[PDB]
Design a binder for this molecule. Structure first.
Ligand SMILES: Cc1ccc(NC(=O)[C@H]2CCCN(C(=O)c3c(C)cccc3F)[C@H]2c2ccc(NC3CCCC3)cc2)cc1C(F)(F)F
Ligand SMILES: CCCCCCCC/C=C\CCCCCCCC(=O)OC[C@H](O)CO
Ligand SMILES: CCCCCCCC/C=C\CCCCCCCC(=O)OC[C@H](O)CO
Ligand SMILES: CCCCCCCC/C=C\CCCCCCCC(=O)O
Ligand SMILES: CCCCCCCC/C=C\CCCCCCCC(=O)O
Ligand SMILES: CCCCCCCC/C=C\CCCCCCCC(=O)O
Ligand SMILES: CCCCCCCC/C=C\CCCCCCCC(=O)O
Ligand code: NA
Lengths: 371, 6
């Protein structure tokens, strides 16, 4: 029953974005079957089916626009017809919750530990900045959680709609730029240690972090500007989302650039970096910090991959296609999986610490060692 | 238009 109801709405969207009568008719045929497949409830479905036949008659005559109008009136009838969340949305909620609790407490503890050594050790500066980016990202989670609980209703305003869903993308660019800087530092410690003795100081590390943060912000603005709220009417609510309407080329362009700058180019460059570093290390007779950073780097690509795959696929698909509709329903889940980046670092630090007393003292040993 | 992220 609940599955047939989604069949109706899915084909309803198909009609809304239909190019000809053939697609309208095909969609309407599937709606009829789904409606009949699904005494007071019988009447409602009966009114629905008749309206489908009305629209179906118009589409059979070849009148596409008139048939689509009759299909829009079908939505008015739907309101007269068990508001449970989709499976992917529910999993997103579970993940969101865990990431929030672990990420807020975990990264707050990291910031605490590394703040003290931040002017004494370069590594503390690196790990501090990664934690701050992860903590800040987690702050959006309660509001994202709430909106999904309220079936995507967004009562927080336009400003929050632009900012809060953007913090995960900010986290993407900030994390990977910081990791790029950390990786450059690791590379130089191993292959150009004379550079490190002449240059490497807390001052340069803080400047590199400033630039990394700044660049991340600039990379986030374009998508930030394309977020809008949208008011719905059946059932009435307010949605928060992205708007590349009448600009399918830009949607595709954004998706591709995000794939390259946010995933592919870092994957290439950091894998080269650590191939150099690991083969050097393994051919000779500091691994603690190195092992931690590799883990954090690895976890970045593991948890962003589904986001990136679904993102690219949707951009190359028509919005009326079954595969697009399926991927759309998975969007929140994919972002929730990406959000695991914002709680995974403290988990990594504690596990790496286990292989070495209290929790803050354990983080100190792992995160504030000097080279 | 598309709610959420994509
Ligand atoms: C989003 C993004 C991710 C990774 C990159 N990486 C690259 O271009 C790379 C450029 C080449 C160097 N590099 C490496 O990862 C790298 C290293 C280390 C060793 C050996 C081979 C390598 F390939 C990136 C890099 C870039 C900038 C910084 N530090 C700066 C100073 C402050 C902010 C960063 C550190 C490393 C670039 C972008 C960019 F440029 F698009 F923003
Ligand atoms: C250090 C040497 C480099 C400094 C060079 C000076 C840069 C500042 C001057 C103008 C910047 C304007 C940039 C405008 C480009 C942004 C447009 C854009 O990002 O498009 C987003 C699109 O929606 C997604 O694909
Ligand atoms: C299906 C969902 C699956 C989620 C499950 C994945 C969670 C990833 C967690 C950590 C990434 C670690 C990957 C392995 C990186 C650690 C290896 C390492 O630290 O390298 C040390 C270096 O080799 C010195 O010899
Ligand atoms: C060929 C495509 C390149 C993609 C990576 C782009 C940036 C790569 C920068 C340099 C790559 C290898 C750097 C080697 C530095 C050697 C220092 C040393 O070996 O001691
Ligand atoms: C939101 C993006 C634009 C803002 C980016 C700024 C990022 C800030 C990074 C570090 C700034 C503070 C520098 C640390 C000061 C103390 C360093 C020291 O005295 O040893
Ligand atoms: C250090 C600088 C890093 C440079 C990274 C190199 C990666 C290339 C950067 C973006 C290239 C993506 C191509 C954009 C496709 C746009 C599609 C379109 O406009 O029609
Ligand atoms: C996993 C290792 C492979 C990742 C390294 C690949 C790095 C790719 C660098 C830039 C590729 C540019 C992609 C061009 C996109 C074309 C967009 C379009 O044709 O519309
Ligand atoms: Na992280």
């Amino acid at each position: 029953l609940e599955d047939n109801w989604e069949t109706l709405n899915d084909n309803l969207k198909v009609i809304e974005k239909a190019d000809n009568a053939a697609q309208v008719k095909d969609a309407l045929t599937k709606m009829r079957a789904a409606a009949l497949d699904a005494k007071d409830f019988r009447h409602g479905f009966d009114i629905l089916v008749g309206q489908i036949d009305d629209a179906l008659k118009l589409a059979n005559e070849g009148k596409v626009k008139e048939a689509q109008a009759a299909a829009e009136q079908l939505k008015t009838t739907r309101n007269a017809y068990s508001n449970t969340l989709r499976v992917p949305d529910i999993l997103a909620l579970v993940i969101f919750a865990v990431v929030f609790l672990v990420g807020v407490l975990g990264n707050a503890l990291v910031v605490w530990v590394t703040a003290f050594e931040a002017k004494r050790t370069i590594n503390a500066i690196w790990f501090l900045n990664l934690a701050v980016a992860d903590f800040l990202s987690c702050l959006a989670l309660p509001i994202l959680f709430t909106s999904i609980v309220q079936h995507h209703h967004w009562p927080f305003g336009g400003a929050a709609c632009s900012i809060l869903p953007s913090l995960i993308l900010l986290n993407m660019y900030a994390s990977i730029l910081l990791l790029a800087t950390i990786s450059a530092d690791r590379f130089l410690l191993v292959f150009k240690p004379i550079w490190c003795q002449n240059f490497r100081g807390a001052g340069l590390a803080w400047i590199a972090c400033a630039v990394a943060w700044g660049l991340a912000l600039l990379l986030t603005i374009p998508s930030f500007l394309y977020r809008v709220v949208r008011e719905e009417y059946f059932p009435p609510k307010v949605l928060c989302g992205v708007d590349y309407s009448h600009d399918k080329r830009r949607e595709r362009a954004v998706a591709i650039v995000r794939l390259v700058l946010g995933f592919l180019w870092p994957l290439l460059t950091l894998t080269i970096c650590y191939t150099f570093i690991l083969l050097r290390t393994w051919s000779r007779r500091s691994t603690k910090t190195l092992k931690v950073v590799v883990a954090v780097v690895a976890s970045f690509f593991i948890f962003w991959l589904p986001y990136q795959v679904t993102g690219i696929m949707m951009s190359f698909l028509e919005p009326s296609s079954p595969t697009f509709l399926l991927l759309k329903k998975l969007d929140s889940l994919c972002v929730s999986f990406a959000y695991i980046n914002c709680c995974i670092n403290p988990i990594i630090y504690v596990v790496a610490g286990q292989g070495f007393k209290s929790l803050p003292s354990l983080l100190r040993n792992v995160l504030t060692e000097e080279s | 238009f598309a709610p959420x992220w994509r």
